[PDB]
Design a protein around this ligand. Structure first.
Ligand SMILES: *[C@@H]1O[C@H](CO)[C@@H](O[C@@H]2O[C@H](CO)[C@@H](O[C@@H]3O[C@H](CO[C@H]4O[C@H](CO[C@H]5O[C@H](CO)[C@@H](O)[C@H](O)[C@@H]5O[C@H]5O[C@H](CO)[C@@H](O)[C@H](O)[C@@H]5O)[C@@H](O)[C@H](O[C@H]5O[C@H](CO)[C@@H](O)[C@H](O)[C@@H]5O[C@H]5O[C@H](CO)[C@@H](O)[C@H](O)[C@@H]5O)[C@@H]4O)[C@@H](O)[C@H](O[C@H]4O[C@H](CO)[C@@H](O)[C@H](O)[C@@H]4O[C@H]4O[C@H](CO)[C@@H](O)[C@H](O)[C@@H]4O)[C@@H]3O)[C@H](O)[C@H]2NC(C)=O)[C@H](O)[C@H]1NC(C)=O
Ligand SMILES: *[C@@H]1O[C@H](CO)[C@@H](O[C@@H]2O[C@H](CO)[C@@H](O)[C@H](O)[C@H]2NC(C)=O)[C@H](O)[C@H]1NC(C)=O
Ligand SMILES: *[C@@H]1O[C@H](CO)[C@@H](O)[C@H](O)[C@H]1NC(C)=O
Ligand SMILES: O=C(O)[C@@H]1O[C@@H](O)[C@H](O)[C@@H](O)[C@@H]1O
Ligand SMILES: [Cl-]
Length: 616
């Protein structure tokens, strides 16, 4: 085996790097009218804390099915229709509380009322419903916030998942017009896209091709205008276990759109379910560990280096979402396509829920450290240059600084992944040759590493015999494998060159973070919260909105029980904005506070205290 060479020139900022992957999503179970019980459940509350605790807004939106099953109604068409938004307010406040946006799929029946989009009585009632919504949440969150949301059509229209609603090829086009004008009526600044399906070659995917034709050439059901707003085009294409085939399928579709619809040439394209394998609930061991994490990175790596960065076609790809915010079910907590592993610990009084952070979710924290400029990189084996369409690849960024709380930064993220297949008995030798690093005050570097050996709570869980209701002790042990293995800051050598020679496993991830010293220390931690889990445990979550620099070693957390002094909580070094505090003694009632610790051992200010009192 000739080593894998990786060259990275930090002098050459080639073009901007966009964080186009910062999305997740899910679907409530049956019955859809009870979606509010799944969605406002204490489980989902913990789930979205974990989603929003990824550093530096690493996950932004949460695309959510059946949202309009959170709206109830009263009266009727002739009598006087009135909507109840209370459950929808609950879910949207919950996203807001976790600094997350909804991928607002205009999807549902308002608890029965909507039944047929060929009935024009209803097509109008829908327009006004959408307009009511928008106006209500514009008043609630401000137009600036709501204008960020991705409003979307009903999910996968060509899969007939409409429940008991008559949505014909034509009725669907009517429904769209109601949505487009319903939003228009509230504000021309809101954004609407669709259809959210496969766009198979005709006559397959009738409604997906129909809608494009409609918005491109057809008539508005309301105004009677030529063509209709189409802010973005969303497709779903999944890999069937192949990472490159996702990208290959997207080019085929895109090319068809570019030819059949000249006006849409510059229309943004999303793949808002860009998953490795269709069927989120299917047990797959590779979904449980780093094998999935790395394959996710590998996909993003291909999209950046083979599509976005530099291409003849230069298709207008704008978003990628891995649809994996689902809560998992016994008896496969880890093996489903989820960001977190759910444990329904029923044998406590009362019963409670625990979530474990899976590697895929942590890997999104490594992607989050990527900055706004893409750096020239070349991966080669023997003499031959390898693109991202290979088991080992890389993404590297630079940060052009501005303020005195900020400085130059580079992040090199190297993946080793054979998609869904692992290779436990293999070592991949790599030689990172970083060059061109510009001079700066106190240049340090930090490595963060993931593999199944060192960083897999599933592997730990399996080692402990797969307990169905782990003990507190056992949760602490599984959680010890959540964060990557982190080497402490080592000053760079002189001359501006760094050569590391790691033996990466397969699968595995390596982030090399190189940082200049900012003049000033970190900013302050905000929005500290203490959510109870069970007697003797709680979750601490908080925001890094005003923390500033990304050159962070960890968050120091301090706890003062009774009225005694504050004491540091001993824990694994983590940039993750959430921590489960499970003291072996069980003493948790007191006050907590948190602050950032940068690579130069400089603390930011402490957060406001959060008092906690356990009520048995
Ligand atoms: C500690 O306490 C906890 C309680 O707090 C306990 O937690 C419980 O654990 C149980 C298991 O241990 C859980 O049981 C399992 O539930 C799951 C999930 O059920 C929900 O969702 C189902 C799927 O919905 C998807 O699909 C539909 C349509 O296709 C969509 O409409 C949904 O939107 C959703 O779509 C997404 O997902 C699909 C993926 O499939 C994607 O393709 C889509 O694109 C979307 O992304 C849904 O079917 C369920 O609905 C049932 O129940 C409703 C009431 O809840 C009811 O209204 C529905 O009509 C339906 O009822 C019918 O079926 C159920 C059986 O589930 C019957 O009881 C009922 O009488 C009706 O016949 C629900 O909304 C579920 O997937 C599992 O079901 C499979 O496995 C069990 C075996 O245990 C079988 O009984 C089922 O037949 C089923 O089939 C299995 O076997 C098949 C053949 O071998 C195989 O093909 C399948 O792959 C599968 O393996 C379980 O039922 C329980 O959910 C959970 N409770 C809670 C609150 O979380 C915990 O157990 C306890 N711990 C311990 C250790 O004891
Ligand atoms: C990525 O590399 C794979 C090889 O692993 C490519 O698939 C091969 O190349 C062409 C595709 O048109 C065909 O001859 C075969 O399907 C594959 N050949 C072999 C020998 O495996 C794939 O085309 C590459 N994808 C991209 C986007 O470059
Ligand atoms: C909306 O529904 C909820 C739950 O059923 C209820 O508590 C609330 O009072 C309803 N809203 C109004 C305005 O009555
Ligand atoms: O792959 C899957 O399980 C499913 O794919 C799509 O059909 C659904 O819209 C998603 O809810 C889910 O991700
Ligand atoms: Cl998947």
């Amino acid at each position: 085996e000739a080593p894998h060479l990786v060259h990275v020139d930090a002098a050459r900022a080639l073009w901007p790097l966009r964080r186009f992957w910062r999305s997740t999503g899910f679907c409530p179970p049956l019955p859809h009218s009870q979606a509010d019980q799944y969605v406002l459940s204490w489980d989902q509350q913990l789930n979205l804390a974990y989603v929003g605790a990824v550093p530096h807004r690493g996950i932004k939106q949460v695309r959510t099915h059946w949202l309009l099953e959170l709206v109830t109604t009263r009266g009727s068409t002739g009598r006087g229709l009135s909507y109840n938004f209370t459950h929808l307010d609950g879910y949207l406040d919950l996203l807001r509380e976790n600094q997350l946006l909804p991928g607002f799929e205009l999807m549902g029946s308002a608890s029965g009322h909507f039944t047929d989009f060929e009935d024009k009585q209803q097509v109008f009632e829908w327009k006004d419903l959408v307009s009511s919504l928008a106006r209500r949440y514009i008043g609630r969150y401000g137009l600036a916030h709501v204008s960020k949301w991705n409003f979307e059509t009903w999910n996968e229209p060509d899969h007939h998942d409409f429940d008991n609603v008559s949505m014909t090829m034509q009725g669907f086009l009517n429904y769209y017009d109601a949505c487009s004008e319903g939003l228009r009526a509230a504000s021309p600044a809101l954004r609407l896209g669709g259809p959210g399906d496969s766009f198979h070659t005709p006559p397959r995917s009738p409604l997906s091709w129909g809608l494009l034709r409609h918005c491109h050439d057809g008539t508005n059901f309301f105004t009677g205008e030529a063509g209709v707003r189409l802010d973005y085009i969303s497709l779903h294409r999944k890999g069937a276990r192949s990472s490159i085939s996702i990208l290959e399928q997207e080019k085929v579709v895109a090319q068809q759109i570019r030819q059949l619809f000249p006006k849409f040439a510059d229309t943004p394209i999303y793949n808002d379910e860009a998953d490795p394998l269709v069927g989120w609930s299917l047990p797959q061991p590779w979904r449980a560990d780093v094998t999935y994490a790395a394959m996710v990175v590998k996909v993003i790596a291909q999209h950046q280096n083979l599509l976005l960065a530099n291409t003849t076609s230069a298709f207008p790809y704008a978003l990628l979402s891995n649809d994996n915010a689902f809560l998992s079910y016994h008896p496969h907590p880890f093996a489903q396509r989820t960001l977190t592993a759910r444990f329904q610990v029923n044998n406590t009084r009362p019963p409670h829920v625990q979530l474990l952070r899976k590697p895929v979710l942590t890997a999104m924290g490594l992607l989050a450290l990527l900055d706004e400029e893409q750096l020239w990189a070349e991966v080669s084996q023997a003499g031959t240059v390898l693109d991202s369409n290979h088991t080992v690849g890389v993404l590297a960024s630079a940060h052009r600084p501005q303020g005195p709380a900020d400085a130059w930064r580079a992040a090199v993220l190297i993946y080793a992944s054979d998609d869904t297949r692992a290779h436990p008995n293999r070592s991949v030798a790599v030689t990172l040759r970083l060059r061109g690093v510009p001079p700066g005050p106190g240049l340090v570097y930090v490595t963060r590493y993931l593999d199944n050996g060192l960083c897999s709570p599933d592997g730990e869980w399996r080692r402990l015999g797969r307990p169905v209701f782990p003990t507190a002790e056992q949760f602490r042990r599984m959680r010890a494998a959540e964060d990557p293995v982190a080497a402490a800051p080592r000053p760079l050598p002189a001359g501006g060159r760094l050569t590391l020679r790691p033996a990466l496993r397969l699968p595995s991830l390596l982030l090399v973070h190189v940082c200049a010293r900012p003049e000033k220390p970190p900013g302050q931690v905000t929005r500290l919260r203490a959510l109870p889990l069970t007697q003797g445990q709680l979750v601490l979550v908080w925001s890094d909105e005003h923390v500033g620099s990304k050159c962070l070693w960890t968050y120091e957390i301090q706890f003062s029980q009774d009225g005694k002094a504050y004491t540091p909580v001993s824990r694994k070094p983590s940039t993750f904005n959430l921590f489960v505090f499970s003291p072996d003694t069980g003493a948790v009632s007191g006050s907590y506070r948190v602050r950032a610790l940068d690579y130069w051992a400089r603390p930011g200010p402490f957060s406001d205290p959060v008092p906690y009192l356990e009520v048995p």
